[PDB]
Amino acid sequence: MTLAKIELLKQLLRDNEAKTVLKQTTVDQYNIIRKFNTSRIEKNPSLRMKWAMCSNFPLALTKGDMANRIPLEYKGIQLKTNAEDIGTKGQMCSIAAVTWWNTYGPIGDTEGFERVYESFFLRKMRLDNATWGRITFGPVERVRKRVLLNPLTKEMPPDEASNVIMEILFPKEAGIPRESTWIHRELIKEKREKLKGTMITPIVLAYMLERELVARRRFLPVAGATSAEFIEMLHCLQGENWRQIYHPGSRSQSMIVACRKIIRRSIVASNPLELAVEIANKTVIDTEPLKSCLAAIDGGDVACDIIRAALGLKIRQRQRFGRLELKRISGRGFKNDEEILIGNGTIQKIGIWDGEEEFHVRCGECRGILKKSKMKLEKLLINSAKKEDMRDLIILCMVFSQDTRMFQGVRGEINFLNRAGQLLSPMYQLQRYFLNRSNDLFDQWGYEESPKASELHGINESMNASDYTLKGVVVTRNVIDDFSSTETEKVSIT
Amino acid sequence: MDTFITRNFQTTIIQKAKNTMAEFSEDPELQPAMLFNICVHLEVCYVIS
Amino acid sequence: SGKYDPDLGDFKTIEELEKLKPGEKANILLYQGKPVKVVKRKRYSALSNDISQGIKRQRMTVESMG
Amino acid sequence: IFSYNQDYSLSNESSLDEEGKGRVLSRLTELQAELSLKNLWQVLIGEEDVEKGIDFKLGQTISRLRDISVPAGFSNFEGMRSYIDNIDPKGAIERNLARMSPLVSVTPKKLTWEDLRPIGPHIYNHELPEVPYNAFLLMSDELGLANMTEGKSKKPKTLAKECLEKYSTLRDQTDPILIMKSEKANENFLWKLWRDCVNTISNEEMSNELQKTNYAKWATGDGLTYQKIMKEVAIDDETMCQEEPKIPNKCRVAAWVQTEMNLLSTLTSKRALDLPEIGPDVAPVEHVGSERRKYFVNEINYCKASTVMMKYVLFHTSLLNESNASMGKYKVIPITNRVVNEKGESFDMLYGLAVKGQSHLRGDTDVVTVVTFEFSSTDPRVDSGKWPKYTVFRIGSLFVSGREKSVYLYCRVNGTNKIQMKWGMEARRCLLQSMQQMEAIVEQESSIQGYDMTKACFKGDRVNSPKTFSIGTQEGKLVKGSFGKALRVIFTKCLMHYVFGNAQLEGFSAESRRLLLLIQALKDRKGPWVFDLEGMYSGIEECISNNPWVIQSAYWFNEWLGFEKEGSKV
Amino acid sequence: WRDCVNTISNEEMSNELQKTNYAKWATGDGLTYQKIMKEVAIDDETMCQ
Amino acid sequence: MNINPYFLFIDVPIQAAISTTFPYTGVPPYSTGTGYTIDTVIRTHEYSNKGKQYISDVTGCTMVDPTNGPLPEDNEPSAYAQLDCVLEALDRMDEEHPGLFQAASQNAMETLMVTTVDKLTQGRQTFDWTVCRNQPAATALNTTITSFRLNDLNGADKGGLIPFCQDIIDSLDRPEMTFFSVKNIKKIKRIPMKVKDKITKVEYIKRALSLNTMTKDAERGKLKRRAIATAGIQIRGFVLVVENLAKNICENLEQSGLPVGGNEKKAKLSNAVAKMLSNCPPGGISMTVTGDNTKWNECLNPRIFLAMTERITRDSPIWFRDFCSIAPVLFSNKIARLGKGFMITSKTKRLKAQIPCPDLFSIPLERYNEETRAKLKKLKPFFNEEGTASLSPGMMMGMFNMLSTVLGVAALGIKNIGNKEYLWDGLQSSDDFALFVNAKDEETCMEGINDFYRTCKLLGINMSKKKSYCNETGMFEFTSMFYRDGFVSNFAMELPSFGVAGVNESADMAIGMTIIKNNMINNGMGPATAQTAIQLFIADYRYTYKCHRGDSKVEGKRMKIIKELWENTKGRDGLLVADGGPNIYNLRNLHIPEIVLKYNLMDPEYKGRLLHPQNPFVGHLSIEGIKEADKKMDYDAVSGTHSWRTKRNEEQCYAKCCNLFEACFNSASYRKPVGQHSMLEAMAHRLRMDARLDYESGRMSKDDFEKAMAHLGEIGYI
Amino acid sequence: SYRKPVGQHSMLEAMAHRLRMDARLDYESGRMSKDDFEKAMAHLGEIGYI
């Protein structure tokens, strides 16, 4: 075939156009050359397929020695023809030959399918061993979330995925391995050993590996579990007015702890960034540096986001204040320094936001919309998710809003530090004070009549779904979906 | 280009290059190629040493 | 290290590449073609470690001068 | 000094070992390769050109075009650029509004029930002609030449041959009795063409192509076409004018549409709609789905609309197959269907024949002519306004059980295209449209009380009465209807939305949805306001011209709006 | 078991599990049949002892 | 008793049964488009006839400028947009967002400096001036690249889109323009050849500015036909860059419905309505205006878009500002081609003839129909001698979707006029806007609605007073999605998607099942509906590929072989629905390809035969579509005999060069190759190495080696 | 946890006493100004337990 390759090359070069294009376009430009196809795409695939299936020989067979296994006409039925072709330069055939091949003909090897299509058989295994339960026909509350459609063996960014695929199934053309093969050496060797002994076309394996590695994420309405295993069956599990019980047939906590430890270690020293990145890229979790699960999940705890910023990775640009994730909707707040007396009687000089603003606010499982003016909280809409999460959301939004009532509600003292022993800004000191003593600003905040309406219903200081709610707070019996346009905008690291 | 710089270079080298550019009053954003060149220079120097 | 350097004649495969002792020079093809000359490594490298140590030395120098 | 092309210059060769130079060169080559993959390599400019920046300057013609393409009041794009970069508007919108005439406004008027009036009053007027039957095939008049068969599936030609063989009197009928020749078609042409059809079907040879090939050419009117000339002669000649557009006729409410709507939505002992099996259901959810599916098919399968839909789908599938296989030869196509009775006997039904013309067409919008001959038991003289497009005979009579009834042949020339031809085989989706909504309905009920109600809504149980909708009316008295009957009504509505579908139907539905949503808002006391009501009404009523389904939809809309008006008192 | 040991090794006085997920899904506590009104069962034909 | 389907709405809300109202099961309307194009030109110039009328001295075509024109004094559509008001809206948007304009412009510039010319190959059919027709984007780009080579124009070989746009702008100044045209020479046979043709500067400018027209036949829910315009390759780069910039800007804007699609849009809709309900004052009313804009592109002047581009890039490099301002300039001086012309016939002689557009006025107008008579009597002033209409004002549908959406969002975001006691905010997306106005009573709500309508009229936006209405918040419709009391019914319109995908058996099946499961997830398709959809799809799939159950007595060519296979193999539960096997798919396993699903149930001989490592029915070049099914939809299939492809329905140069390169470097077909050297030398080196390795392994004979090396030396690489 | 004057006290009386003490503490610590103090006692005077 290499001789056929050289003969075809010589014949192609005999024309001057081939000589001038080949000697002109560099290897990089080849992509452009490939994309100059006719693009005479069929206007209606259904009609085309219908017509073709009725034709004598619609199948376009590639020239080869396979045809000799089957006669051009078997049992008085025409199968294949020896007429030349112009579109593909091969032969023509009919589905009759395909059915005969499925009936008789050469018998192939069954080994390759045990491991090559591992993801599909794992899907089948998770389906078969799953345990079903009852069906709840009552209404189901669903939230729109960014979910991973399918489980991944090891989530990696697209470029690393492509490089790994090439390093696996393309032994040649592997110049200068980057700082990605050492991270995924175990995956490289495992997939290499598994796929060895096959004869499938390499492109099929490459696409299957891309599916098995590159992540696929989408906005979906979900209620309950969110792991890819449950998302696979979301079409059956969920339902607008029906729900089903399903149980399909870790590293996260460890990475959270490691990132927190790195942050605490680096902060106490001077120039924390270099020390933190040194420890982060010098760390490992049982087979791999920390850039193997940090790069896997989207965002995460604030410590992980800070470490990813210190390292090279993309982090969602949501504003983290304590535990609150804030997304601005409108308005511009002018941060101006001001001297304000605290409820304890002391006077603090801190930055206050002049002007009106609104933020989508998230905390754990609680979502809401907050609208605040300078030195005052104006409105807050929430959904009933969890008592702990709701209390955290209320208190944190209270502290963030810098409402004068929150300042006047202080009763103890603010001189706290961190595990590293540092004095924080008054905002975070107040955050810690109020979270430690939740029943401090709640009592003196003041109460507001219940939100008289079809669905809007109040919540009391104890987080129970009780009327006579807090001033401003409102709980709507609907679904609040927020945090759109996750641009991952450019963010600097000090 | 800045995305490539962030991906292929450590944050430390990027910080050093940005500091060097600031010393010369040159904006890293307006001359991303120069920032990449400075980052490569720092990286090769560290690799040599 | 280096360019084509035809002194070695034709190129050699990975299997024949391994036969060369450490420190030799070989003529290989990089990516889709791009003939080059390579040298077998005698160690395993870690660019992150090198950069971190360089930064540590730099800041040690800065502190000592300060 | 190191270069990206794997070469270097060293003042002293002993300063760096082999490993150091190799590693630096490897890093440089990796950077170069990554840049090339990201296409930044060419854009990248070294330590001598990085002080220049990108160069992209506008030529002369483009600069002039930019200069003359500036808003009014400017004389050069530099002027506009400076104006935009410097001038600051601080209330220009209010300044413009403060002077704009007060004769422009949305004209906000609150909408009440009285404002809503019947749409398309011209249908009521009796001076206009009754709407004709323009659908492709007969729906409530099809006469099924039914032959019991063991179950073997055979070619349509052989099936039609056998069906005619059973009925020798109709097969060998050769002296027609013209009941009515509509306006233009020729009785001789149609009768001779039908006789050739019967002879071809009953011929011993398996070929199903017309043996004349010349009489049909004039029977179908293929030769009655203009001959195209070149533009020059048309310019020179004075009598070569432009045909005036042919607008659709403005008709009135017919009566056959209502009767067909009623009849196609009734159970019949005959069932044709069959569906392929699916895998075993192991999850509870799919068990519930299977129960619902069974309860639905037990209802839809026996309605005549399902049989009509299957007949349409089969006819269009066969038409597409014949057109693709045969391009430039006239063909004979039986209008075949398969019907299983409750006892499991798989009757094959022949509903007529059709001559297909020459379908040699490269494009899809190109028209192909087909003439349909249809068996029927309805004498058109009972209502001649329904059949102004049909030339019919009286080809005999038959006994179904001892009650003799006549048998006529409705002959009509028509034309289709590959688009409608494909949509014929996609008309099955009506079934889906019938289930989805009902599914939702049932699900809503399930939301109320916990258990599953699909047996309760359909047949009822000891705790809940069977679900009943409002389906019809009589003497001004609205009547309820079972869940199955409502499902049948929805399925027939979808089938009619298909069969009588064209531009008018789309323009009517997509524009009367405005009034539907306005009525829905009014029923919820949202106090909807409107800007130009007469505009919406005119938009809607400029679509009720000649489509029978559009006229009947307008009539039913007016009646239902009257009902809502009378019931709004509470 | 991991959740149980985590709860045992924590500091709160209570011995109450807080990760109810695996506890609920492990003992088959969600697979219990749902009781319906007797009338439906009488009407239903697939409900047999 | 007389049945009445409408009575269903007596016992059910309209939104719940909204799916049945739409006739999305019948034949969609289908079509000369010259009449519609002339009517569109007539309407576009009529709306702006009061502007400043001048004559372009670069092309000689009449131009009408409505910008800064007289303020409309009537409800009729107005394209007279005041520039100062547009800049005020842009400034308010900039103030309301932190440096969004700068970030968006910088990101657009960065992604532009990385974009390649070949990106222009995507999209739909494009106008080709070398033939003055509509050709596939790839072919049009290739032909223009080839033509440019003759007139000393280059940059396509240079790669990036910057040089291609630069030499495109240069081409407008060349005193001549040479290219290759198709010559259908008579020899009787009509043989097409390439003829080196030349055109002058004015002709080339007109060709580049011309906009080809076609009839929008695919429309489903509109009686009257609209004309869609396709532009040339010389505008594609600039339009693409401006559209990307506008997308970057509008993505952050919470008021923009685009480019997010699917459940994201529903989330945005519900979130916005909930926000407005929360923001209402005590006892005040938040009214929702369901709006459906009309003449959304026949009133938008490209000059306003030029101003918007300049203001958006307030702080950016001068070169980028000039580059991104070219598209508004090209659109502000565009020309419209005119269909294929009217047809005149005489019935006394059975004669007919289509009159090409250039000869529109070669005939006495007294021979056209009265309607076309008036159309031509009104189109005469702007008619070009070549047969094109000078259409400066307004835009054709589909070009600046993102930029027009950004202008609409700018109008929405003003949020107040005169500090009146109300506020407004809404959702806008490409000719569909839903507005919300909060006040203390209905009267103030409509005061605000009228103020917003007036403000829209100051930008060329003219909301349709006939297709729009107003009601209380909590019930409205946006882009055919209905919201009522928190219930957002995805209007069931994905019904025309259950037909076979027409790519091959296994792929069609996978696509169909994935479509069913996605519909279940998104549109609320009930389990019974999904089961029936599976049934109907399997029926159609079996019928279309002539493969029913082997047991069934149906006759067919492949059916006989299926019958044979039915008993020639014992395991009968492992056959595929393409091999007459029993259907096994249900709701629980729509996400699993059937080949893996039935792998256990197959027989060793059957799986060996079907899953052979080599199949003459499977080819490498057939793998292109294994990822995305043409919208690019991802589907999961399995390699096998049923993975075949249908027969086909400087071309060969590029095609065979790329094919040979792929066959040499098998890795090229998957990932972009990298290298700064000629393709020829890479292939030569690879082939030399491969020949040596083949010989050393004994796979090639010595004479074979010598022949190969002789050929390589002849090539000049050894 | 427990500030209820239990022992058959009318819940309204207990509320009146609790609010009186809360207002006293708020004023003493400075949470409320004299205007709010007097307003609260006015309302508490209107209650009947003050």
CSV table of C-alpha atoms in Angstrom, one decimal, chain D residues 385-534:
chain,number,residue,atom,x,y,z
D,385,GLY,CA,-73.0,21.4,-3.4
D,386,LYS,CA,-70.4,19.1,-1.8
D,387,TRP,CA,-69.3,17.7,-5.1
D,388,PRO,CA,-68.8,20.4,-7.7
D,389,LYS,CA,-65.2,19.1,-8.4
D,390,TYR,CA,-66.2,15.5,-9.1
D,391,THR,CA,-67.4,13.6,-12.1
D,392,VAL,CA,-69.1,10.4,-11.0
D,393,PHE,CA,-70.8,7.3,-12.4
D,394,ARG,CA,-73.1,4.6,-10.9
D,395,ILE,CA,-71.2,1.4,-11.5
D,396,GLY,CA,-73.6,-0.9,-9.7
D,397,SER,CA,-74.8,-2.0,-6.3
D,398,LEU,CA,-73.8,-4.4,-3.5
D,399,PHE,CA,-75.2,-6.2,-0.5
D,400,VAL,CA,-73.4,-5.9,2.8
D,401,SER,CA,-75.8,-8.1,4.8
D,402,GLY,CA,-79.0,-8.2,2.6
D,403,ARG,CA,-79.7,-4.5,2.4
D,404,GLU,CA,-78.9,-3.5,-1.2
D,405,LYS,CA,-77.0,-0.2,-1.6
D,406,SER,CA,-75.7,1.5,-4.7
D,407,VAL,CA,-72.0,1.8,-5.6
D,408,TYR,CA,-70.7,4.8,-7.5
D,409,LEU,CA,-67.3,5.8,-8.7
D,410,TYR,CA,-66.1,9.3,-8.0
D,411,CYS,CA,-63.5,10.5,-10.6
D,412,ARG,CA,-61.4,13.6,-10.1
D,413,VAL,CA,-58.1,15.0,-11.4
D,414,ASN,CA,-55.7,16.4,-8.9
D,415,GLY,CA,-52.0,17.3,-8.3
D,416,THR,CA,-49.4,16.9,-5.6
D,417,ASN,CA,-45.7,17.4,-5.0
D,418,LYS,CA,-42.9,15.6,-3.2
D,419,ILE,CA,-43.4,17.8,-0.1
D,420,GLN,CA,-47.0,16.9,0.5
D,421,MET,CA,-46.1,13.4,-0.8
D,422,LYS,CA,-43.7,13.0,2.1
D,423,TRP,CA,-46.0,14.6,4.7
D,424,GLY,CA,-48.5,12.0,3.8
D,425,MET,CA,-46.4,9.4,5.4
D,426,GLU,CA,-45.7,11.8,8.3
D,427,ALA,CA,-49.4,12.2,9.0
D,428,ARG,CA,-49.2,9.5,11.7
D,429,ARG,CA,-47.9,12.2,14.1
D,430,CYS,CA,-51.5,13.2,14.6
D,431,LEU,CA,-51.7,10.2,17.0
D,432,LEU,CA,-48.9,11.7,19.1
D,433,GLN,CA,-50.6,15.1,19.2
D,434,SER,CA,-53.7,13.2,20.4
D,435,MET,CA,-51.9,11.5,23.2
D,436,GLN,CA,-49.6,14.2,24.6
D,437,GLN,CA,-52.4,16.6,25.6
D,438,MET,CA,-54.5,13.8,27.1
D,439,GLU,CA,-51.4,12.5,28.9
D,440,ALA,CA,-51.0,16.0,30.4
D,441,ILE,CA,-54.7,16.0,31.4
D,442,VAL,CA,-54.4,12.6,33.1
D,443,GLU,CA,-51.1,13.7,34.8
D,444,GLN,CA,-52.9,16.8,36.2
D,445,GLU,CA,-55.5,14.6,37.7
D,446,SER,CA,-52.8,12.4,39.2
D,447,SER,CA,-51.3,15.6,40.8
D,448,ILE,CA,-54.5,16.1,42.7
D,449,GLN,CA,-54.9,12.7,44.3
D,450,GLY,CA,-51.9,10.5,44.7
D,451,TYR,CA,-52.9,7.3,43.0
D,452,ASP,CA,-53.1,6.8,39.2
D,453,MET,CA,-56.4,7.7,37.5
D,454,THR,CA,-56.1,6.5,33.9
D,455,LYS,CA,-58.7,3.9,34.7
D,456,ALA,CA,-60.8,6.5,36.6
D,457,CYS,CA,-60.8,9.2,33.9
D,458,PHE,CA,-61.6,6.7,31.2
D,459,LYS,CA,-64.1,4.4,32.9
D,460,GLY,CA,-64.3,5.7,36.5
D,461,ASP,CA,-64.0,3.9,39.8
D,462,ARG,CA,-65.9,3.5,43.0
D,463,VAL,CA,-64.4,6.7,44.4
D,464,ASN,CA,-64.2,9.0,41.3
D,465,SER,CA,-66.8,9.5,38.6
D,466,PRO,CA,-65.7,9.1,34.9
D,467,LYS,CA,-64.2,12.3,33.5
D,468,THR,CA,-66.5,14.1,31.1
D,469,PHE,CA,-65.7,17.0,28.8
D,470,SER,CA,-68.0,19.3,26.8
D,471,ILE,CA,-68.0,17.9,23.3
D,472,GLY,CA,-70.9,19.1,21.2
D,473,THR,CA,-74.3,20.7,21.3
D,474,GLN,CA,-77.9,20.3,20.1
D,475,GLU,CA,-80.8,22.8,20.0
D,476,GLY,CA,-78.5,25.3,21.8
D,477,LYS,CA,-77.9,22.8,24.6
D,478,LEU,CA,-74.2,21.8,25.1
D,479,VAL,CA,-73.6,18.1,25.6
D,480,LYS,CA,-70.9,16.3,27.6
D,481,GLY,CA,-68.7,13.5,26.3
D,482,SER,CA,-66.7,10.7,27.7
D,483,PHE,CA,-62.9,10.9,28.0
D,484,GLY,CA,-62.5,8.5,25.1
D,485,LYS,CA,-64.9,10.6,22.9
D,486,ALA,CA,-62.9,13.8,23.8
D,487,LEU,CA,-59.7,12.0,22.8
D,488,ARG,CA,-61.3,11.0,19.5
D,489,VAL,CA,-62.4,14.6,18.9
D,490,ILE,CA,-58.9,15.8,19.4
D,491,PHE,CA,-57.5,13.1,17.1
D,492,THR,CA,-60.0,14.0,14.4
D,493,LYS,CA,-59.2,17.7,14.9
D,494,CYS,CA,-55.5,17.0,14.3
D,495,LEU,CA,-56.3,14.8,11.3
D,496,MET,CA,-58.4,17.6,9.7
D,497,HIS,CA,-55.6,20.1,10.6
D,498,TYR,CA,-53.5,17.9,8.3
D,499,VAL,CA,-55.8,17.0,5.5
D,500,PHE,CA,-57.3,20.5,5.0
D,501,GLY,CA,-53.9,22.2,5.7
D,502,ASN,CA,-52.5,24.9,3.5
D,503,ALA,CA,-51.3,28.5,3.8
D,504,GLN,CA,-54.8,29.7,4.8
D,505,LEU,CA,-54.9,27.3,7.7
D,506,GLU,CA,-51.6,28.4,9.0
D,507,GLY,CA,-52.5,32.1,8.7
D,508,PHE,CA,-55.8,31.5,10.4
D,509,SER,CA,-54.5,29.4,13.4
D,510,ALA,CA,-51.3,31.4,14.1
D,511,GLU,CA,-53.4,34.6,14.1
D,512,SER,CA,-56.5,33.4,15.9
D,513,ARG,CA,-54.3,32.2,18.7
D,514,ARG,CA,-54.1,35.9,19.6
D,515,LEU,CA,-57.8,35.9,20.3
D,516,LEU,CA,-57.6,32.5,22.0
D,517,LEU,CA,-55.0,33.8,24.5
D,518,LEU,CA,-57.0,37.1,25.0
D,519,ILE,CA,-60.1,35.1,25.9
D,520,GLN,CA,-58.0,32.9,28.2
D,521,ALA,CA,-56.7,36.0,29.9
D,522,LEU,CA,-60.3,37.4,30.2
D,523,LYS,CA,-61.6,34.2,31.8
D,524,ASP,CA,-58.9,34.7,34.5
D,525,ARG,CA,-59.9,38.3,35.0
D,526,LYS,CA,-56.5,39.6,34.0
D,527,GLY,CA,-58.1,42.6,32.4
D,528,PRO,CA,-56.1,42.4,29.2
D,529,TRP,CA,-55.7,45.6,27.2
D,530,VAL,CA,-55.4,45.7,23.4
D,531,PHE,CA,-53.8,48.3,21.1
D,532,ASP,CA,-55.6,47.6,17.7
D,533,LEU,CA,-58.3,45.0,17.9
D,534,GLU,CA,-59.7,45.6,14.4
